[PDB]
Amino acid sequence: MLNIVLYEPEIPPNTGNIIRLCANTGFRLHIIEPMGFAWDDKRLRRAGLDYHEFTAVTRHHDYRAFLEAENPQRLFALTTKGTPAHSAVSYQDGDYLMFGPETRGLPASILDALPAEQKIRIPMVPDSRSMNLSNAVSVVVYEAWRQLGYPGAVLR
Amino acid sequence: MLNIVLYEPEIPPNTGNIIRLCANTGFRLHIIEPMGFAWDDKRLRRAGLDYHEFTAVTRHHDYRAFLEAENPQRLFALTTKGTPAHSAVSYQDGDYLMFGPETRGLPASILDALPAEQKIRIPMVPDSRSMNLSNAVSVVVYEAWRQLGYPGAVLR
């Protein structure tokens, strides 16, 4: 059982896409408030999300409340200032995978809470530009899920 | 050198995200006309694309013209009716990776042009819903690029 964590997400369709992604992969989604948009925002549901897809989602008032509710064994953070490629890490049951907003990525007070080797990065060519957030989460999730042999996936 | 192929893409921000992705990974992008939107569409550039990112992109009048210009050694197609998981395949230099529109995915006349083991699928949990197209391309691309050891990526 793997978990995605969105810190203060900013752009409604990214979060809509990531809810779909969690539904397709069996991962749980954690959202750390405050978000830059309302759940009621029409842009969120342009995706055509079913009711069932929201039952995987947990809202946390802030980062401390998330840590108290969830008590993550291992917490990874995607950051461009990170050392190992996200595929150089060995994922395992109960890992939480954490992402910052489309603009900022994650605050120092959160990144400093993590050892260096839990701060991962998605490889890029020199002089890259920022990646769409839901693309980044997809890559990170599927590589993890692959490492685990895709438990829960239709085998046919 | 790997190549992404979008068949008649439909939704401008997906193509904008995929142009960014090609810029970040060094892949070339091929687009098979007709597209469901104009290059001039404001929705395409909400991404904040630089001029240089368009120099990786080639427009093809149709699928036959693409095959005549590019002469792909190996052509893969993502389809939900496909047998191997996209990670069960061994990618290599000069592979073309082909995707259908956000709605339809690819016409029979194109899929029939391909052997079974070049028709790949992204694993999903039972009773999945459709995946955002630029998420799907990202997963397929990064898994390929990983297999190749990320040639061209900043090693630091």
For each of the domains in chain A, give its residue range(s) and CATH number, in order of start. 1-156 (3.40.1280.10)
User: Distance of CA B144 to CAs A47, B92, B96, B148, B150, Å?
Assistant: 27, 8, 11, 7, 9
Q: How far apart are CA B131 and CA B136, in angstroms?
A: 6
- SS3 category, A27: coil
Chain B CB contacts of A154 under 8 Å are: 123-126, 128
Q: Which of B109, B84, B54, B96 is nearest to A129 (CA)?
A: B54
Beta strands in A35-149 (DSSP E): 57-60, 75-78, 96-99, 119-120
- The strand order across the sheet containing A3-7 reads A57-60, A28-32, A3-7, A96-99, A75-78, A119-120
Q: How far apart are CA B80 and CA A41, in angstroms?
A: 30
- SS3 category, A32: strand
* Cα angle: B93, vertex B98, B104; to 5 degrees: 170
Contacts of A56 by beta carbon, 8 Å cutoff, 6+ apart: A19, A22, A23, A27, A28, A29
Amino acid at B36: G
CA-CA-CA-CA dihedral for A125, A130, A134, A140, to nearest 10: 40
How close A76 comes to chain B (CA, Å)? 19
Helices and strands per DSSP (H, E), number in chain A: 4, 6
Q: Which of B94, B23, B120 is nearest to A135 (CA)?
A: B23
How close A113 comes to chain B (CA, Å)? 23
Provide the greatest CA pair distance for chain A: 45
For A152, phi and psi rounded to 5 degrees? 100, -10
Chain B CB contacts of A84 under 8 Å are: none
Q: Which of A3, A33, A4, A40 is nearest to A134 (CA)?
A: A4
How close B42 comes to chain A (CA, Å)? 17
CB B44 within 8 A of CB B14: no
User: Distance of CA A136 to CAs A6, A55, A109, B58, B106, Å?
Assistant: 12, 23, 22, 25, 25
CA-CA-CA-CA dihedral for B21, A90, B96, B6, to nearest 10: -40
Q: Find out whether the peptide bond into B9 is cis, omega within 30 degrees of 0.
A: no
Half-sphere exposure in the Cβ direction for A42 (13 Å, CA): 0
Binding-site residue numbers of A for S-adenosyl-L-methionine are 78, 100, 122, 130
Q: How far apart are CA A154 and CA A152, in angstroms?
A: 7
**Cβ-defined contact of B143 to A143 (cutoff 8 Å):** yes
The minimal CB distance from B135 to the residues A124, A138, A145 is found for A138
Nearest chain A alpha carbon to B142: A139
Chain A CB contacts of B48 under 8 Å are: 129
Q: How far apart are CA A47 and CA A22, in angstroms?
A: 13
Q: Please tell me what DSSP assigns to residue A54.
A: G
Q: How far apart are CA A35 and CA A60, in angstroms?
A: 10
Chain A CB contacts of B121 under 8 Å are: none
Q: How far apart are CA B91 and CA B26, in angstroms?
A: 16
The minimal CB distance from A124 to the residues B122, B135, B154 is found for B154
For B107, phi and psi rounded to 5 degrees? -60, 150
Within 10 angstroms of residue B72's Cβ, the number of other Cβ atoms is 17
Method: X-ray
Q: Please tell me what DSSP assigns to residue B76.
A: E
